[PDB]
Design a protein around this nucleic acid. Structure first.
Ligand SMILES: [Mg+2]
Ligand SMILES: [Mg+2]
Ligand SMILES: [Mg+2]
Ligand SMILES: [Mg+2]
Ligand SMILES: [Mg+2]
Ligand SMILES: [Mg+2]
Ligand SMILES: [Mg+2]
Ligand SMILES: [Mg+2]
Ligand SMILES: [Mg+2]
Ligand SMILES: [Mg+2]
Lengths: 127, 83, 114, 99, 152, 100
RNA sequence: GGUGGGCACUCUAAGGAGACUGCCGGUGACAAACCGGAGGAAGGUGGGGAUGACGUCAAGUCAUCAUGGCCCUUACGGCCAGGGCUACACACGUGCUACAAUGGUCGGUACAAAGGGUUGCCAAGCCGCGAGGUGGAGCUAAUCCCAUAAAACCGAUCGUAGUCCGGAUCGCAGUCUGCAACUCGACUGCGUGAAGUCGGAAUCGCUAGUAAUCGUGAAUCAGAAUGUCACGGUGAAUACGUU
């Protein structure tokens, strides 16, 4: 059975497998809270699952590579959205209204010559 | 500073001109250019004229300069004063 | 109470003030001579101030340390070596910038002529 | 069980060489997996262009190195040992291992 | 901008309370991207408010912002030879921004053990108006009547 | 980039390369913990025997066409203001302009 | 994933599809176009880069190079030892660190990207508080090494004091490369501990992964980066308007 999804965000790539269950939630074979330490990451992961009142309807097994905690949380959200829509293909409109399937295309801007940061410049005294 | 793996450092011709010197007591300053060489307590009392850039300044060695190099007792920049 | 020690402070911090002890050797004295670092020196018993006095008198402090640094400084000066002259004028001795930014060894700006 | 490693500067030559060697190996009776591509090394250089003082005027150049891997299952015909002059022509370097 | 094509992004990521103003206050108190630090500081402040204040802390929060928001704002315009000031009604969206900024910048200047209980102190003071933020609000308000002559 | 100066760095290259072995042996014996102070000291004397113009520190690499002491790229052999000239003509293999 | 094994997935790298105001509504001189909507990962040149017209400033470079003239030829040409370019009553530009409690310490703790390495990286082990030393493994490298990210989170402590802040300066003792660390190197150990209480006239950078803040890598190079170039972590506020 089961379904699959992939979520990418902020150089973070996550794979999600969805099976029947009640939402044990395993992050690289680890407890959800043992991974997400004192942050909203748990809630942002649970956002799309709870938007469709299916928190206890499924069990989730995921893995994550690359990026920071916020990027991995966003990747989990996107991946579980793409996995859930693969099961109940009538809620695509609901997620489109919620704007969860849409990927975040923002990415770090490269540094350029003559500048300190990607856009910061020196002070420019005129005399 | 130089590691403990190497105790002294002396110009070899300086070593030969000091070791041969001690056969007789202090009678003439010894002319030297290598400011880098260490000085041990075995040329104490000898007067060494160390090169400074335009002249050989003579300095009389004592026992209380074993741990300081030849160049420390010769100044190369004058700075007589702004006014 | 040592030599003009403060109170209401942890043992190591209080010990640090005696000019010859910092964070490391204060911790060593605190651990060796059995005392609680958490316990404030105010509530420490008289059984420990004598031990701390022994530890303080063991190494160095105050007058001897001032005298030996001053002896070293005059030792450098009287010979006439480069470092001695550098410390004589008050200019930096390690060899930092003197064209500018050598302020802590010159004082205020002291503008020209007047 | 031999493995062939290909180094190149531009992918245009390396793709042609890999296709040629794969076709020859499959035609001669050998068994060959799928050409494996490796991450391409990118060497970055930045150089002043003015002959005198202009620090903000740079030029950035890049050297790309492409890596390919192949394997031969059931080695039956060593005809590839008579074709190096043809398999590698101008800018492709070929290494053969585990003969 | 002369073009006026710059649209605005919408942020709503309340972790547990599920409100709107709370997140914007989070951003206001957030410094150098320390979002979790802001989380814990503001939540400790709100816990102190909840233990001190009998009712829920969110309506106390909105009441406090109700007493800090300035109704009108004065803004200097130069007539071409004299430096005047002109009172204008504040944009409805701008009221919340001024409220949040003033409350944060005034909670920053107490001087007690931390700014969590500072934020609590000015949150309760602004709940009826004995703080310093309300002092600046009423001063700016009274400057309008002080300059009602021009208005137009 | 006077040609006498290029000559006197090339001669430095030969002088450095022509020993290439006494330096290694002497320094290895010096750095060997179990060699006795006598073999420390004679090795120091031996190192001080040979001319100073033998070490790699005295060797300042230079452009192979102009000899500019500054602006060097050791992946190539050219200077700052000849690498670009050769690259724009396509002489350097696999060199292009980068954007990413 | 350690093993047998698989071609599911991530990923790596080649070739393609896709975004073209394409469809619907209104405005519009029934034109160009504008304002909305649906779908879609992406919507209005999607984001960033490379790309710099005719010419101006007798703009910069004769010292990278080449070249018309002029100049010296026992010297303005060559070689070698030391010294200086790191000097110091002052002034200015560009930066780093702070003046603290959204902090400083202590314990264990989770997640990056990019890159360099066979005249090289240099592991395990052992000896040192320590910078390091012996040792010799693996690697021509998605295979071995550099290499443990940090800010973040939890608990304990300090209680706003020029201080469990801040580190300049200085004294003593050391490690390492180098023929050689005085002039004139980088780090390490103990101790000393300054100015600094957020900065006048004036002035600067920035519109979304932006500012701010946190760490990592490469070039030059025996050694020497708060500089240059490059990569990711967290991550805002504001724009009514053109006098
Ligand atoms: Mg990038
Ligand atoms: Mg950045
Ligand atoms: Mg200025
Ligand atoms: Mg010439
Ligand atoms: Mg060199
Ligand atoms: Mg649209
Ligand atoms: Mg001109
Ligand atoms: Mg010379
Ligand atoms: Mg200079
Ligand atoms: Mg401190």
């Amino acid at each position: 059975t089961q379904n699959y999804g992939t979520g990418r965000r902020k150089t973070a790539t996550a794979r999600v497998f969805l099976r029947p269950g009640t939402g044990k939630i395993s992050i690289n074979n680890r407890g959800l809270d043992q991974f997400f330490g004192r942050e909203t990451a748990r809630m942002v992961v649970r956002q799309p699952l709870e938007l469709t009142e299916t928190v206890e309807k499924f069990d989730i097994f995921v893995t994550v590579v690359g990026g920071g905690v916020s990027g991995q949380a966003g990747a989990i959200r996107h991946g579980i959205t793409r996995a859930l829509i693969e099961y109940d293909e009538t809620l695509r409109s609901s997620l489109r209204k919620a704007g969860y399937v849409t990927r975040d295309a923002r990415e770090v801007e490269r540094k350029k010559v003559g500048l300190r940061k990607a856009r910061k410049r020196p002070q420019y005294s005129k005399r | 500073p130089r590691s403990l793996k190497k105790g002294p450092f002396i110009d070899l011709h300086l070593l030969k001109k000091v070791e041969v010197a001690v056969e007789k007591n202090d009678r003439k300053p010894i002319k030297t250019w290598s400011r880098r060489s260490m000085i041990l307590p075995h040329m104490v009392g000898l007067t060494i004229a160390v090169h400074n850039g335009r002249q050989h300044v003579p300095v009389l060695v004592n026992e209380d300069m074993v741990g300081h190099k030849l160049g420390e007792f010769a100044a190369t920049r004058t700075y007589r004063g702004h006014a | 109470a040592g030599v003009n020690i403060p109170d209401n402070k942890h043992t190591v911090i209080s010990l640090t003030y005696i000019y010859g002890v910092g964070r490391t050797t204060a911790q060593s004295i605190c651990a060796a001579t059995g005392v609680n670092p958490a316990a404030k020196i105010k509530d420490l018993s008289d059984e420990q101030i004598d031990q701390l006095r022994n530890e303080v008198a063991k190494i160095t402090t105050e007058g001897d340390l001032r005298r030996e640094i001053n002896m070293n400084i005059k030792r450098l000066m009287d010979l006439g070596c480069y470092r001695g002259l550098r410390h004589r004028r008050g200019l930096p001795v390690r060899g930092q910038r003197t064209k500018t930014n050598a302020r802590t060894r010159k004082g205020p700006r002291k503008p020209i002529r007047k | 069980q031999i493995r062939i490693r290909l180094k190149a500067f531009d992918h245009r030559l390396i793709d042609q060489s890999t296709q040629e060697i794969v076709e020859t190996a499959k035609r001669t009776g050998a068994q060959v997996r799928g050409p494996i591509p490796l991450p391409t090394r990118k060497e970055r250089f930045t150089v002043l262009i003015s002959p005198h003082v202009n620090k903000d005027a740079r030029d950035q150049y890049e050297i790309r190195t492409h890596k390919r891997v192949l394997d031969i299952v059931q080695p039956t015909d060593k005809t590839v040992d008579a074709l190096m002059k043809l398999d590698l022509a101008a800018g492709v370097e070929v290494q053969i291992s585990l003969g | 901008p002369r073009r006026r094509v710059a649209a605005k992004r919408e942020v709503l990521a309340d972790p547990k309370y599920g409100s709107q103003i709370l997140a914007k206050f989070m951003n206001h108190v957030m410094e150098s991207g320390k979002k979790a630090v802001a989380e814990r500081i503001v939540y400790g402040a709100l816990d102190k408010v909840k233990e001190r204040g009998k009712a829920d802390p969110l309506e106390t929060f909105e009441k406090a912002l109700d007493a800090i928001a300035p109704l009108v704002e004065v803004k200097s315009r130069r007539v071409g030879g004299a430096t005047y000031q002109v009172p204008v009604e504040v944009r409805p969206s701008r009221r919340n921004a001024l409220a949040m900024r003033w409350l944060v910048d005034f909670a920053r200047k107490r001087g007690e053990k931390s700014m969590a209980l500072r934020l609590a102190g000015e949150l309760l003071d602004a709940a009826e108006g004995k703080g310093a933020a309300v002092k600046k609000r009423e001063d700016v308000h009274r400057m309008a009547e002080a300059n009602k002559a021009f208005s137009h | 980039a006077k040609e006498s100066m290029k000559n006197r760095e090339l001669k430095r290259q030969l002088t450095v390369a022509k020993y290439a072995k006494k330096r290694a042996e002497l320094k290895a014996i010096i750095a060997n913990p179990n060699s006795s102070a006598e073999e420390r000291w004679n090795a120091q004397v031996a190192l001080q025997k040979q001319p100073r113009d033998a070490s790699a520190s005295r060797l300042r690499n230079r452009c192979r066409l102009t000899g500019r002491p500054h602006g060097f790229y050791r992946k190539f052999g050219l200077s700052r203001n000849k690498l670009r000239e050769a690259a724009m003509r396509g002489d350097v293999p696999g060199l292009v302009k980068a954007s990413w």
